[PDB]
Point group: C3
Chain length 199, copies 3
């Protein structure tokens, strides 16, 4: 099965580890064996000042790759959004999109692996954003994921082995003259902080 | 202590990764140090003609638990019903989906308690032996798929299997549970192949695909 | 950010695996990268003489946190009560609005303590509870100290550890570690002299999934 999903993640934190705003909305194409995505879109929000932005970006990707279904971040047991819970706002959108493409948009939320994969990529693109904006940043990553930074790419991985080894990967130019570290958010258990400093 | 628990796990999936029915119901005997079971029973259902509501599974679960309990005489029976550890023979609408299911479990547990003095408790996901039964269910579902294959089998929550020449090993993927596992002797056919990968519809659940 | 937190954990269990009482209350100083504590205080209860209202525990927790905070001067104290991070100074019955009904009896003891300590220092005590990593680290240390207590106080003893943690025994120390990799590798170490004539085993609590049992048995 080919699935398009979307989620928003990554948060700019203040000096007291309190979130200012979210960083990245990502749409991903996920196919078997459903551990990662090689095909995705990113929309950077403005962190320093929603489910709609996810569903829109998902639709944009779906028209490009023609998936079997779209997963949205709403936990409703996988019910088709056109056959519908604030996400009733998206029912008419789900209705007309199905009529146009034959693609079902389903409210599966936290039960969805592709949504989780989209979330991991949001974390990765949040780090990329940090790499490309850093004199010091605190980025709050999505729940239990870590990143590795190599010369030409960032790797994202879920910390939960129960998820079966979900991961992400984004090629990007990693600048010299930076210092990064990764550590637990003291205020939010199971969430990691990506702190970066320009040398 | 000596505990008997039961559960039903393993689901034949369709093309849309949605379950058509359940496969294996297992009763286990668990003793110290409570990581696995050396003594267990299994009952297979018909997955292609299954009561997906849950009534059938829980009936099979309590019947099979009782049966194993008669043989091994455990201190107590754990049922996969997350209701605070209350005795099933006292399950009323008052003490409380499960209201309906209590209707066909309460008299049965009451009868069994009168025969044996052994309580059947609705402890559910708080029970390690229940979880061990669930893991064995996944193992027996995989054994079943090895004998009825192609197939798409949805495994119980966060567990994987390894397939040897002479046995199937199941293990929890959650290290927080403390290394829960199970083994089942079996033979493995020729002219087949299998993969284990995330169920894209059910986070933290794995899929066993075989051809 | 430098944080002092406290929690009470570790339980003497009966052979039906039910807690008789809690053992250790621990206050910890936690600094970046917030994985462990190298500065901590411990107070032992009597598990056989224990109040599971939780009143005695939260009282012990706050006073021990304050005592430690006076010596290390943290930016903030984390208390294990999950209320969203409200300052305990401002914890009145008006602000509370059975969870509500319970914390208004406790507020009569907690609020003035927090108030007095803030006036002295400007340091806030926040009711953050379970989302706090330093609280979790305190909990891990409580599990460690409960084992140390059990080692010193045993012909057999079942120690119920706090949720998903293990302990390792070394010749000169006890190590505690979270079993949840999602927490990023939280742990703690306490130096002790391990007594002879005893054996130990770590295994799952069959009645409480994700809780381990540390059982000690006298030798010979
Ligand atoms: Mg979301
Ligand atoms: Mg069950
Ligand atoms: Mg506590």
């Amino acid at each position: 099965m080919r699935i398009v999903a979307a989620d928003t993640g990554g948060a700019v934190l203040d000096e007291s580890f309190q979130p200012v705003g979210l960083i990245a909305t990502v749409a991903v194409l996920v196919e078997k064996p459903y551990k990662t995505s090689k095909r995705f879109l990113v929309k950077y929000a403005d962190p320093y000042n929603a489910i709609r932005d996810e569903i829109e970006l998902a639709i944009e990707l779906a028209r490009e790759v023609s998936p079997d279904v779209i997963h949205l971040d709403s936990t409703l047991g996988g019910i088709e959004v056109r056959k519908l819970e604030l996400s009733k706002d998206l029912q008419p959108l789900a209705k007309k999109f199905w009529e146009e493409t034959g693609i079902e948009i389903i409210a599966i939320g936290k039960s969805s692996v592709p949504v989780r994969i989209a979330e991991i990529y949001a974390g990765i693109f949040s780090v990329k954003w940090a790499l490309d904006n850093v004199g010091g940043l605190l980025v709050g990553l999505p729940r239990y994921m870590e990143v590795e930074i190599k010369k030409d790419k960032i790797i994202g991985k879920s910390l939960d082995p129960r998820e079966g080894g979900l991961y992400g990967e984004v090629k990007t130019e990693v600048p010299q003259g930076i210092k990064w570290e990764l550590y637990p958010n003291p205020l939010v258990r199971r969430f990691m902080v990506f702190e970066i400093t320009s040398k």
